[PDB]
Amino acid sequence: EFAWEKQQRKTFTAWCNSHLRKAGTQIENIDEDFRDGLKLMLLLEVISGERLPKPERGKMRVHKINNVNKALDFIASKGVKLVSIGAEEIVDGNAKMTLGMIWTIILRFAIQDIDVEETSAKEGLLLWCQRKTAPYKNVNVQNFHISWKDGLAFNALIHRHRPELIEYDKLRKDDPVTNLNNAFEVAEKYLDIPKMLDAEDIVNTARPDEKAIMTYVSSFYHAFSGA
């Protein structure tokens, strides 16, 4: 397992759980817990607000294949042409394909419909970050990786919306673990955004995984898009 794979596994698991809690469940092991399709279908129902077809609960491989195909068909119905994702391989436990499928879902259901100043999707999310953090001279959001490493950008995004929650000028660029954990804990407690990044992974990786950071940042957007 490379650095990127570990980061995606942890962050995508946490994101899935932030939704599955609304249906009274959770996953633990992303490599195993979508193989029968049941929680994959439930995830899709939660994030879309829509009902999918009845699943098969019989536990034979055919049932699992049929469930995963219901999930994939639903994704396709939202205008996604799936590439390199197949039900048999999901059921049989292809770890990289499973991460790619969950990223496809995050991108479609959390990022694509973002619209900021006539700019859509990941580009619109980045523009929003840049606009909201513009006042903060010790922040420079240029990307969804290195720009987030020192923790100041996460704190600034919160402070811009909820300044009473962040003592921004007390934050030190040279204390990234403190900064990251501060933002993560404030978001968990006051914004009901579960923690999806580990501070240690962020400071230790030269270029943090941009899919993991986008996943987490997109939850801030949704917490704050009605401001």
UniProtKB/Swiss-Prot annotation:
Modification type Phosphothreonine: residues: 205
Domain of life where this protein originates: Eukaryota
Tissue spec. comment: Widely expressed.
Residue ranges annotated as motif LXXLL motif: 40-44
The Calponin-homology (CH) domain, residue ranges: 6-110, 119-225
Ranges where the record places region Polyphosphoinositide (PIP2)-binding: 133-148
Residues where N6-acetyllysine is found: 70, 170
Stretch list, region Interaction with VCL: 3-17, 64-82
Record region (Actin-binding): 3-225
Annotated compartments: Nucleus; Cytoplasm; Cell junction; Cytoplasm, Cytoskeleton, Stress fiber
Oligomeric and partner information: Homodimer; antiparallel. Binds TRIM3 at the N-terminus. Interacts with MICALL2 (preferentially in opened conformation); stimulated by RAB13 activation. Identified in a complex with CASK, IQGAP1, MAGI2, NPHS1, SPTAN1 and SPTBN1. Identified in a IGF2BP1-dependent mRNP granule complex containing untranslated mRNAs. Component of the CART complex, at least composed of ACTN4, HGS/HRS, MYO5B and TRIM3. Interacts with MAGI1. Interacts with PDLIM2. Interacts with PPARG and RARA. Binds to VCL; this interaction triggers VCL conformational changes. Interacts with SEPTIN14. Interacts with IGSF8.
Disorder cited: Focal segmental glomerulosclerosis 1: A renal pathology defined by the presence of segmental sclerosis in glomeruli and resulting in proteinuria, reduced glomerular filtration rate and progressive decline in renal function. Renal insufficiency often progresses to end-stage renal disease, a highly morbid state requiring either dialysis therapy or kidney transplantation.
Function text: F-actin cross-linking protein which is thought to anchor actin to a variety of intracellular structures. This is a bundling protein. Probably involved in vesicular trafficking via its association with the CART complex. The CART complex is necessary for efficient transferrin receptor recycling but not for EGFR degradation. Involved in tight junction assembly in epithelial cells probably through interaction with MICALL2. Links MICALL2 to the actin cytoskeleton and recruits it to the tight junctions.
Domains as described in the record: Contains one Leu-Xaa-Xaa-Leu-Leu (LXXLL) motif that mediates interaction with nuclear receptors.
Assigned protein family: Belongs to the alpha-actinin family.
Protein name: Alpha-actinin-4
Source organism (scientific name): Homo sapiens (Human)
